[PDB]
Design a protein around this ligand. Sequence first.
Ligand SMILES: Nc1nc2c(ncn2[C@@H]2O[C@H](COP(=O)(O)OP(=O)(O)OP(=O)(O)O)[C@@H](O)[C@H]2O)c(=O)[nH]1
Ligand SMILES: [Mg+2]
Length: 409
Amino acid sequence: PREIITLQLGQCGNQIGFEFWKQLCAEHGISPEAITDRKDVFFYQADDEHYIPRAVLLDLEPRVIHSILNSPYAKLYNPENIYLSGNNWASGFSQGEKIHEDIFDIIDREADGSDSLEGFVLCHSIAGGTGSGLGSYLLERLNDRYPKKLVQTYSVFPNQSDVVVQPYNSLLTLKRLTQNADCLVVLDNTALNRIATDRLHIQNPSFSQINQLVSTIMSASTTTLRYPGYMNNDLIGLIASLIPTPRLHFLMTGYTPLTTDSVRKTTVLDVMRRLLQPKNVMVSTGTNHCYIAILNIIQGEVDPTQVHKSLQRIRERKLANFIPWGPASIQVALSRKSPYRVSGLMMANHTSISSLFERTCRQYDKLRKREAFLEQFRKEDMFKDNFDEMDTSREIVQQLIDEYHAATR
Ligand SMILES: Nc1nc2c(ncn2[C@@H]2O[C@H](COP(=O)(O)OP(=O)(O)OP(=O)(O)O)[C@@H](O)[C@H]2O)c(=O)[nH]1
Ligand SMILES: [Mg+2]
């Protein structure tokens, strides 16, 4: 009975968000407006026996939000939750301070509506301006206006440019994602593509097509909260299981049934089996590294006897290389689906996730060791360098994540 409020920022933020609410709606049998599962967690009971999502659509430009509003779901969202006011993280981190008040009026209100709020989900992108700039700002404010309230995020990492400063905004955000966020579901645009392109066969994969994937995961990873059971009914119940120590709290995901249309047999076996095949992992990396915990959420019929049998085959084929300094264990979670074949979702805190952070700095340093485009960011309270404060921090994240693969740990 724990509520979750969702903050959607920037195009990226608000587009994976649109899809997100399109997906959950389908499941809970809600129409683009209104109507045993737990809807409360993500929805609110309208003053007309109808439904509306606990979502805050924030953007610094009208284009994207009006597409949603001039769409089939315009009637779903809570009108007073839609806010509209730069390209730079500085410009984004900026206006937030400017829009602060106007924003929390919507944030604190939904914050009231909830009786037992757990925390916040922030959909957004790391590159870009608003998502990172405004988003980093919120992540700092949220960490004060609500100190106990947990914070998770679905952060979209850029593909592999055409922004020029992605490596800037990105570092400046990864910081606020390291210390001002409890859980960090990492969505790698590169990885999303490969799939869309490969395991789907689309030469020029669009964002709609790409976001269709993200919705699936954004959707699956929250099934145990919406079709609740005895164990795993708190968001903190999931994250806790995936985060032994702080900082190290960046996860990577993956889904099994991705294509086709018949097979001879598809059991939970080849479902857990594939979730470890990196080809299905939505992140890009390039011995040593190992998982720090693994979760698998299977939907539909399963009979927990078969599951023990699947783990064993893994233990002997050594398919999963876990940490050396502790209990190598993967958690399964047999969740339901909505009343409308198997299906599996993996969420892991794996070491090589440091790879993306590394891939970002090298780009940063390079662009930094030339004082590149520093003219636009230094255009508002960047009369020195918070930049350095961030790099160092991010380096810490790469330091512990690697140090995490050492038996010493
Ligand atoms: N998966 C996914 N990635 C996206 C989507 N839209 C943008 N991105 C990525 O996210 C970044 C773009 O953020 P937008 O550019 O979407 O948002 P911020 O709002 O950029 O920009 P400004 O408001 O102009 O400051 C780039 O790294 C894009 O590759 C989307 O719908 N889905
Ligand atoms: Mg934008």
